[PDB]
C-alpha cells in the first residue's frame, strides 16, 4: 500500500458485485459504489465510498471500470451528446435521493401516490436505459430531456423538496448565478409549471379516472368508440360505395385520427384504399369515398374491414355476413336496399 | 441475472428489519378488533393497542365506536411478551375446538391465530379477511425474532429488494457485469502515503 | 395565428425583399405616408388609415431601410446625397406628432396617443444608421407627450420595447434615453396614482435591468453609477407604499435585488452614501436596513425555491455588506453620536442568519455540499462579520450589551462547529465592557439575560452535548485571561454548565418518554433546580408548566398545591415591588393584592373540586381576614363565607375513599440517575389494586418483571 498519488481521473469508480472483505475496511460492496478516490496505484485504488465517505476501501482495478470521466463530461468530450450528461448525473442523484424516499415511505401508508410512483419511478429508469443509448435523434433527446426534469421536480414536489430551473443544457447554465432577474423570471416559470401541473394532476388524478366509464355522472366524449358508416352496393352496377362519415367520441389524446378499409377475400388482402391525412381531432369527418368492384355472385362472402388509427389500435371492425352484435343490423339494411345511401350507427 | 441475485439474496439485513418496525407502528396505530361469540347483546368492537414503547398491549371489552380506537386504560393492560411460548394457527385453536354452543363458522377458517398464554387460558382473536389477518401474523413472529408469513409480506419483499437491486445497477450500465471474481495482484507491504491523507 | 412558419415567411418577406427590385424612391412614398396619418386627420378615414397599421407598412420599411433606401442611396444616390432629408421629412412626421398628437386632436388622443406611441419603437430597431439623429429625435419623443395624469400603462410599454432594442449600439443611446425613463419612475413613486403601473413599472424596471446586464451587448458602469444615484432610494420608497405583501411585491424584490447586485462596492460607495444631511440620510438608511429585515423575516418566496432565495440570500449579503462599510466609516466615532441604529443593524443581522440551518442542509446527505459548494455556507460569513463588527464597535458597546444578548445566542446556537467556534467570544467581550463598567454593578446584568434566553432558546430544542462542551471550554479559556472578575466568570460559567446539563435532560426526557409521570418527574426537577439557584421568573415559568402538566391530567391537589407554591412568594400589600410575578399568557398592572385574591380564588376552587376540603377552608380564612382588614370588599367576604360554610357541610356530611399506599423499589443500575436505587411511595387513587398499579409501573418502563 505504498506508491499513492492525487489524481482526478477516478471520478467513477465502479463495482462489480459483492466485493470481499479480505481488507478489515470492506463488506459486500453492492452494485453500484462510487468511490471518490484520492490515490493512485497500478491495479488498485483506495478511495472514498459513497456509502461512507470518511471511510477508505482499497479495490482492485479488476474491479473497478476504467473511467476518466468527471461529473463534468465534455471536458474529456465524454459527453456521447454535448449539453446532456449533466442530465444524467443529476438523474443519478435524483435516484439517490428516491433511496431514502422509497426507505421512508413504508413506515407509514400513503399507498395510492406510492402505487403511482412505483409506475412512474419504472417510467423514469425506463428512459434513462434509453438513453444510455445514444442511438435516439436529438428530437428525442430534448423530448426526453423536458420529461426527465418534469419528473425531477414532480417528485420535489410532492415531497416538500427544493426546486430546478434551466430545463434546458442540464439544468446548470441558468442555476449558475449568472444574472438575478432571468432567475426570477425563470423561478416563476417552473413554479408556474408547479401550479399547472398541480391542478392538473388534481383533476386527472381524481375526477377524470373516475368521471367516466365507472361513475354514471356527465362527462365529456372518451372511449364509448363511436363510428357511423354509410354503404352501398348496386346490383347491375357491381360497385361498392362505402362513406367514411365521421367518427367522433375519442379518448385521451387522440393523436392524428386517420382511417382505414380493405377490400379482402381470403387470407391475402386484394385492394386497399389510401385517404388524407389530418392532425389530433375528437371529432373527425373526412366523409371519403373510394370504390372497390366486386358483383353480385361474389358479394355473398367477403372481408369488409375497417379500423380507426391513431399509432395504437383503438379498435377493429369487420362487417360482413360472419358479423356480431352490432353490424348484423347494417348488414341487413345494406343488403335489403341497393340504390340508397344508409347511415348506420355502431361501436367496435 | 445470477451474481445479481445471489448479492439480492446475500443482503438480508436492513430490508426485513426495517419491515418489522414498520409492522410495530401497524400493531401501535390500533384498529377495531373482533371478539368471540356474540349473539345476546354482547359487543363486537374492541381494541388491542400496542405501546409505543412497543413492549405491551392495552385491550379489553370495549364500545361500538364508529370512528375507531379509543385511547384509554383499557379492562386487560397487560400482555407479556417476555414468556410467550407462541401463537398458533390453523386449527390448533383451543376456542374452535368447541363442541358445545360456542361451535364456529367454517367460512371463518382463514381468520384463526391464537395467542396462548398461561399455558391454560387462551386469548383469541378474530381478523376481517386474509390481508390483514397475514399483518397480525407478521407482527406476532415479528415478536418472536423469526420469519414473516404474509402474502403482503411476500408481495413487499419481493418488489422491495428488486427494487433496490435495481437502484443499484446504476454505476455499472453500458458495461458487462463479470460473474468471475477478478484476481487480487500483488501489493506494496510498506503504509508510505506518498499523497498525504483526509 | 394557425399556419405560422412558411406563410408567415412571407409575412416577413425575405422572399418579397430579396426576390424582387425594392430599387424605387420609396421616400416619396414616405412623405405621402406621412401626410395619410396627420393631414387625414378626421373621424373616420383617420380611424381606418391609422388603425389598420399598426406597423405593417412600417414593418415593411423594417426591411426597406437597407434593401430599399441603403441600396437606393448606394446604386444611385451614392454621389447626390440625400442620406440627411429624411430626417427632416421624418421630424415633419414628428412634429405633426407634438402638434396633432398633443394640441388639436382631443378625442383619439385616448386611442391615437396609445396608438402611435406604439409605432416607433417597432421600426426604430433596424434602422441603425445615423445614430447621433436617432439620439435627437428620441429625446424628442420625449419631449412631445409630456402626457396629461392618465396613467394608461402605455408610454411604459413603449418605453419596453425602446429600451429593448436598439441598447447593442448602447453608448449613444443608453444616457440620452435613460432620463425621461427615471422621470416618470420617479412619477411613479409617489403621486396618488402608483396602483394603474405597479405592473408597468416592474415589467419596466426587470426588462431594464436585465438588458443592462448582458455581458457584451453593451459598457454600462457609469450608467449603472447613475441608475443607483437617481433609484435606490426611490425603489426603496417603492416598497415603502408597495409595502403590502398581497401585491407582485416579489416582482419588484427581484428588481431591486438585481440593481443592488450589479452594482460594486466601487459603484455602491461614491454617492448614493454620499447624500445630504446627515438626519435625511439616517431616514434613508432606516428604511433600506428595517425594509430588508421586514423581508427576509416573513420571506416573500414560497419557501420551496431554493436556488432564488439563496440569491436573494447572497445579494442581500452584498447588499448589507456595503451599507454597513460605510456605517463604519461615517456613523462610528467620527459621527458625533445617536447610533442607535445599529440596533436595527444587528437585528436584521441575526434575523437574516437564523434559517438554512441543517434540517435542510441536510435533507439529502449531499444536500449540504450542494449549498457549500455553490453558494457556499452563507451563515459562516454573515458570522464572521458579526464578529469582526462586534470587535469592531468598540467602547460603546456598554450602550449596546443588555439590549443585544438576545438575538447574539441565535447565532452561537447553530448547529456547524465552526460557526459556532468563531461565535462564542463575544460573551466575554460583553463581560469585558461590564467590567469596564464594574464602577458600578458587575456582569450580573449580561448574565441575567444570558440565562432567560438561554433557557427559553434551548427548551426550544436547538443546543447539544457538543454545544454545552463547547461553551463550557470557550467560556473557561477566555474567562482564565483576564483579572479576578473573570476567577467569578469561571465560576458563573460552571453554573451555566450544570443549567445546560439540567436542561438537557429535561429536554431529552420530555419527548423521548411521553409518559406524563416522568415529564412530571423531570420538570420538578428542573423547578427544583431553579428554586436552588433562585431566579424566580422563569421558576414561574415553569411553575405554570407544571401546572399546565397536572391540569391537563386534572391532578386538582398537586395543580393547586403548586399554585400556592406561586401564591406563596407574594405578599398582601399595596405596591407592586417585583414586576417579574406576571405570566406571559396576561400581562398588565396588577399591584400584588389583586394577584394574589385571583391566585387564592382558583386555590380555593381548584381544592374544591380535588376533594381537599381542610386545605380549601384553612386558606378561605386568610382571604377573608385580608378582605375584611384591608380592603373591606364585603361582597367578597360575603361569598367567601358562603363557600366556606359549603366547605364544613361537605367535610361532614359525606364520605370519601382512602387512597392506596404503595412504595416502589427501582432497583438495579439500567435506571436513570434519578430513579437509581432509592424507593419511590407513589401515593395511589381511591382503591387501587396492587396488580393495576405494578401494571402501570410496567407500562412505565421496559424489562416489567418482579
Not at chain 3, 406563410?7 to 430599387?23: A, M
Not at chain 3, 447565532?411 to 467556534?421: D, F, G
Not at chain 3, 420538570?523 to 415553569?542: A, G
Request: charged letters at 25%; proline letters at 4%.
Amino acid at each position: 500500500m505504498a506508491r499513492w498519488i492525487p489524481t482526478k481521473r477516478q471520478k467513477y469508480g465502479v463495482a462489480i458485485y459483492n466485493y470481499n472483505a479480505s481488507q478489515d475496511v470492506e463488506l459486500s460492496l453492492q452494485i453500484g459504489d462510487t468511490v471518490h478516490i484520492l490515490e493512485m496505484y497500478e491495479g488498485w485504488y483506495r478511495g472514498y465510498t459513497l456509502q461512507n465517505k470518511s471511510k477508505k476501501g482499497i479495490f482492485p482495478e479488476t474491479y473497478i471500470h476504467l473511467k476518466e470521466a468527471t461529473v463534468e463530461d465534455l471536458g474529456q468530450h465524454e459527453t456521447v451528446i454535448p449539453g446532456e450528461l449533466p442530465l444524467v448525473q443529476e438523474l443519478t442523484s435524483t435516484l439517490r435521493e428516491w433511496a431514502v424516499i422509497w426507505r421512508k415511505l413504508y413506515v407509514n401508508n400513503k399507498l395510492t401516490l406510492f402505487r403511482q410512483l412505483q409506475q412512474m419511478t419504472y417510467s423514469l429508469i425506463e428512459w434513462r436505459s434509453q438513453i444510455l443509448s445514444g442511438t435516439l435523434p436529438k428530437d428525442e433527446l430534448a423530448e426526453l430531456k423536458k420529461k426527465v426534469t418534469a419528473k425531477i421536480d414532480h417528485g420535489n414536489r410532492m415531497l416538500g423538496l427544493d426546486l430546478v430551473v434551466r430545463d434546458d443544457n442540464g439544468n446548470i447554465l441558468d442555476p449558475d448565478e449568472t444574472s438575478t432577474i432571468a432567475l426570477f423570471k425563470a423561478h416563476e416559470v417552473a413554479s408556474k409549471r408547479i401550479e399547472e401541473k398541480i391542478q392538473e394532476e388534481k383533476s386527472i388524478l381524481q375526477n377524470l379516472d373516475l368521471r367516466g366509464q365507472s361513475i354514471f355522472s356527465t362527462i365529456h366524449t372518451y372511449g364509448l368508440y363511436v363510428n357511423f358508416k354509410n354503404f352501398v352496393c348496386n346490383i347491375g352496377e357491381d360497385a361498392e360505395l362505402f362513406m367514411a362519415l365521421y367518427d367522433p367520441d375519442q379518448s385521451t389524446f387522440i393523436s392524428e385520427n386517420y382511417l382505414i378499409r380493405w377490400g379482402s377475400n381470403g387470407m391475402p388482402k386484394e385492394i386497399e384504399k389510401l385517404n388524407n391525412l389530418q392532425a389530433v381531432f375528437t371529432d373527425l369527418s373526412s366523409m371519403d369515398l373510394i370504390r372497390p368492384r366486386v358483383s353480385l355472385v361474389c358479394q355473398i362472402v367477403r372481408v369488409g374491414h375497417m379500423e380507426l388509427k391513431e399509432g395504437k389500435k383503438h379498435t377493429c371492425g369487420l362487417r360482413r355476413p360472419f358479423g356480431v352484435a352490432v353490424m348484423d343490423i347494417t348488414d341487413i339494411i345494406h343488403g335489403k336496399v341497393d340504390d340508397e345511401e344508409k347511415q348506420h350507427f355502431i361501436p367496435f | 441475472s445470477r451474481p445479481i441475485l445471489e448479492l439480492k439474496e446475500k443482503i438480508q439485513p436492513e430490508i426485513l428489519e426495517l419491515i418489522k418496525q414498520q409492522r410495530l407502528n401497524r400493531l401501535v396505530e390500533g384498529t377495531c378488533f373482533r371478539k368471540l361469540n356474540a349473539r345476546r347483546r354482547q359487543d363486537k368492537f374492541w381494541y388491542c393497542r400496542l405501546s409505543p414503547n412497543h413492549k405491551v398491549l392495552h385491550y379489553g371489552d370495549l364500545e361500538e365506536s364508529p370512528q375507531g380506537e379509543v385511547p384509554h386504560d383499557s379492562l386487560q393492560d397487560k400482555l407479556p411478551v417476555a414468556d410467550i411460548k407462541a401463537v398458533v394457527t390453523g386449527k390448533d385453536c383451543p376456542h374452535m375446538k368447541e363442541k358445545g354452543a360456542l361451535k364456529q363458522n367454517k367460512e371463518v377458517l382463514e381468520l384463526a391465530f391464537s395467542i396462548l398464554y398461561d399455558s391454560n387460558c387462551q386469548l383469541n382473536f378474530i381478523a376481517p379477511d386474509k390481508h390483514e389477518y397475514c399483518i397480525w401474523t407478521d407482527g406476532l413472529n415479528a415478536l418472536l425474532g423469526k420469519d414473516m408469513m404474509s402474502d403482503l409480506t411476500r408481495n413487499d419483499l419481493d418488489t422491495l429488494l428488486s427494487m433496490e437491486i435495481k437502484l443499484r445497477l446504476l454505476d455499472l450500465e453500458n458495461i458487462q457485469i463479470p460473474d468471475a471474481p477478478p484476481p487480487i495482484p500483488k501489493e506494496p507491504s510498506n503504509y508510505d502515503f506518498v499523497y498525504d491523507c483526509n | 395565428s394557425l399556419i405560422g412558419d412558411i406563410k408567415f415567411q412571407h409575412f416577413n418577406p425575405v422572399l418579397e425583399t430579396y426576390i424582387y427590385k425594392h430599387f424605387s424612391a420609396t421616400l416619396a412614398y414616405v412623405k405621402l405616408s406621412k401626410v395619410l396619418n396627420f393631414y387625414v386627420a378626421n373621424a373616420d378615414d383617420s380611424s381606418k388609415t391609422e388603425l389598420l397599421f399598426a406597423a405593417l407598412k412600417a414593418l415593411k420599411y423594417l426591411f426597406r431601410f437597407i434593401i430599399q433606401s441603403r441600396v437606393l442611396y448606394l446604386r444611385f444616390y451614392g454621389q447626390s446625397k440625400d442620406g440627411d432629408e429624411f430626417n427632416n421629412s421624418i421630424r415633419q412626421l414628428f412634429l405633426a406628432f407634438n402638434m396633432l398628437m398633443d394640441r388639436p386632436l382631443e378625442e383619439a388622443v385616448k386611442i391615437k396617443g396609445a396608438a402611435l406611441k406604439y409605432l416607433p419603437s417597432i421600426i426604430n430597431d433596424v434602422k441603425l444608421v445615423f445614430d447621433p439623429v436617432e439620439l435627437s429625435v428620441l429625446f424628442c419623443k420625449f419631449i412631445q407627450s409630456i402626457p396629461d395624469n392618465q396613467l394608461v400603462r402605455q408610454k411604459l410599454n413603449c418605453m419596453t420595447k425602446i429600451v429593448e432594442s436598439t441598447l447593442f449600439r448602447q453608448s449613444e443611446c443608453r444616457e440620452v434615453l435613460l432620463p425621461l425613463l427615471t422621470d416618470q419612475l420617479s412619477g411613479q413613486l409617489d403621486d396618488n396614482s402608483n396602483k394603474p403601473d405597479h405592473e408597468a413599472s416592474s415589467q419596466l424596471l426587470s426588462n431594464i435591468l436585465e438588458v443592462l446586464d448582458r455581458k457584451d451587448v453593451g459598457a454600462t458602469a457609469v450608467h449603472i453609477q447613475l441608475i443607483m444615484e437617481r433609484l435606490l432610494r426611490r425603489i426603496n420608497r417603492t416598497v415603502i407604499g408597495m409595502n403590502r405583501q398581497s401585491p407582485h411585491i416579489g416582482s419588484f424584490v427581484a428588481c431591486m435585488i438585481a440593481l443592488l447586485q450589479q452594482m460594486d462596492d466601487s459603484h455602491y460607495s461614491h454617492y448614493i452614501s454620499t447624500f445630504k444631511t446627515r438626519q435625511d440620510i439616517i431616514d434613508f438608511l432606516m428604511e433600506t436596513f428595517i425594509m430588508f429585515k421586514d423581508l427576509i423575516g416573513k420571506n416573500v418566496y414560497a419557501k420551496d425555491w431554493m436556488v432564488m432565495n439563496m440569491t436573494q440570500n447572497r445579494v442581500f449579503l452584498r447588499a448589507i455588506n456595503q451599507f454597513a462599510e460605510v456605517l463604519t466609516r461615517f456613523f462610528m466615532d467620527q459621527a458625533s453620536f445617536e447610533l442607535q441604529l445599529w440596533n436595527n443593524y444587528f437585528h436584521l443581522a441575526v434575523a437574516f442568519l437564523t434559517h438554512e440551518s441543517l434540517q435542510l442542509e441536510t435533507f439529502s446527505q449531499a444536500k449540504r455540499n450542494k449549498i457549500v459548494k455553490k453558494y457556499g455556507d452563507m451563515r459562516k460569513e454573515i458570522g464572521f462579520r458579526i464578529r469582526d463588527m462586534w470587535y469592531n464597535l468598540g467602547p460603546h458597546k456598554i450602550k449596546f450589551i443588555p439590549s443585544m444578548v438576545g438575538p447574539i445566542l441565535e447565532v452561537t446556537l447553530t448547529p456547524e462547529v465552526e460557526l459556532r467556534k468563531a461565535t462564542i467570544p463575544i460573551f466575554f467581550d460583553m463581560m469585558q465592557c461590564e467590567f469596564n463598567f464594574s464602577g458600578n454593578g458587575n456582569f450580573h446584568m449580561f448574565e441575567n439575560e444570558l440565562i432567560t434566553k438561554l433557557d427559553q432558546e434551548v427548551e426550544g430544542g436547538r443546543g447539544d452535548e457538543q454545544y454545552k462542551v463547547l461553551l463550557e471550554k470557550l467560556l473557561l479559556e477566555h474567562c482564565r485571561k483576564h483579572k479576578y472578575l473573570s476567577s467569578s466568570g469561571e465560576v458563573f460559567a460552571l453554573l451555566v454548565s450544570s443549567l445546560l446539563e439540567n436542561l438537557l435532560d429535561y429536554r431529552t426526557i420530555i419527548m423521548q418518554d411521553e409518559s406524563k409521570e416522568n415529564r412530571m418527574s423531570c420538570t420538578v426537577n428542573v423547578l427544583n433546580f431553579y428554586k436552588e439557584k433562585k431566579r424566580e421568573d422563569i421558576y414561574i415559568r415553569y411553575l405554570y408548566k407544571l401546572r399546565d402538566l397536572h391540569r391537563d391530567c386534572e391532578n386538582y391537589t398537586e395543580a393547586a398545591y403548586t399554585l400556592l407554591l406561586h401564591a406563596e412568594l407574594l405578599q398582601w400589600s399595596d405596591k407592586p415591588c417585583v414586576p417579574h410575578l406576571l405570566q406571559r399568557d396576561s400581562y398588565y398592572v396588577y399591584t400584588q393584592q389583586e394577584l394574589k385574591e385571583k391566585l387564592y380564588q382558583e386555590i380555593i376552587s381548584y381544592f374544591d373540586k380535588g376533594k381537599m376540603w381542610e386545605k380549601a377552608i384553612k386558606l378561605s380564612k386568610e382571604l377573608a381576614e385580608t378582605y375584611e382588614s384591608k380592603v373591606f370588599d364585603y361582597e367578597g367576604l360575603g361569598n367567601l363565607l358562603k363557600k366556606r360554610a359549603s366547605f364544613y357541610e361537605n367535610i361532614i356530611k359525606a364520605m370519601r375513599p382512602q387512597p392506596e399506599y404503595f412504595a416502589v423499589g427501582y432497583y438495579g443500575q439500567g435506571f436513570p440517575s434519578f430513579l437509581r436505587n432509592k424507593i419511590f411511595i407513589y401515593r395511589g387513587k381511591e382503591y387501587e389494586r396492587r396488580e393495576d398499579f405494578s401494571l402501570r409501573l410496567l407500562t412505565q418502563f421496559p424489562n416489567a418483571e418482579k
